[PDB]
Design a protein around this ligand. Structure first.
Ligand SMILES: CO[C@H]1C[C@@H]2CC[C@@H](C)[C@@](O)(O2)C(=O)C(=O)N2CCCC[C@H]2C(=O)O[C@H]([C@H](C)C[C@@H]2CC[C@@H](O)[C@H](OC)C2)CC(=O)[C@H](C)/C=C(\C)[C@@H](O)[C@@H](OC)C(=O)[C@H](C)C[C@H](C)/C=C/C=C/C=C/1C
Length: 107
């Protein structure tokens, strides 16, 4: 599944609803592995609509329990991420992923 561990607390009040646009900064890495992406390096926040299956399952269920301002470590098992196929050319089969995610605001 996805384990959410808090790095910095959010407001504890404003949680995303399905259909809202979530605005975040993230860094992704393979568990005990290489870092493969970071929006911080580009300083362009990443945006996605919650509930529409635009992103992997671990983000759908992990960010839905975060409040605005929260920063958290999400550890996501292969079946909540790219599973047995991986993501062509970047993520191998059966990879556990770790993301540092900061929920900046909702739109
Ligand atoms: C250049 O950087 C990429 C992001 C890269 C891709 C490679 C991976 C290692 C990675 O580095 O991100 C990464 O760190 C990662 O694993 N991410 C991105 C952050 C959210 C979590 C995860 C993910 O789910 O990626 C996603 C993953 C790779 C594929 C999806 C996983 C879930 C599944 O349900 C989807 O099928 C529908 C496919 C990529 C995304 O977050 C982007 C936003 C979404 C898509 C491309 C699809 O949902 C697409 O459907 C056709 C859409 O409906 C979109 C909105 C349509 C518009 C025009 C296209 C936007 C494209 C922007 C893409 C961006 C910024």
């Amino acid at each position: 599944g996805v384990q959410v561990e808090t790095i910095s607390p959010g407001d504890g009040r404003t949680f995303p609803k399905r259909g809202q646009t979530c605005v975040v900064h993230y860094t992704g890495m393979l568990e005990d592995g290489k870092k493969f992406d970071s929006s911080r390096d580009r300083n362009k926040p990443f945006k996605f609509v919650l509930g529409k299956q635009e992103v992997i399952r671990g983000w759908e269920e992990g960010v839905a329990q975060m409040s605005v301002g929260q920063r958290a470590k999400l550890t996501i098992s292969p079946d909540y991420a790219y599973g047995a196929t991986g993501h062509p050319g970047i993520i191998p089969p059966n990879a556990t992923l770790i993301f540092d995610v900061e929920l900046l605001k909702l739109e």
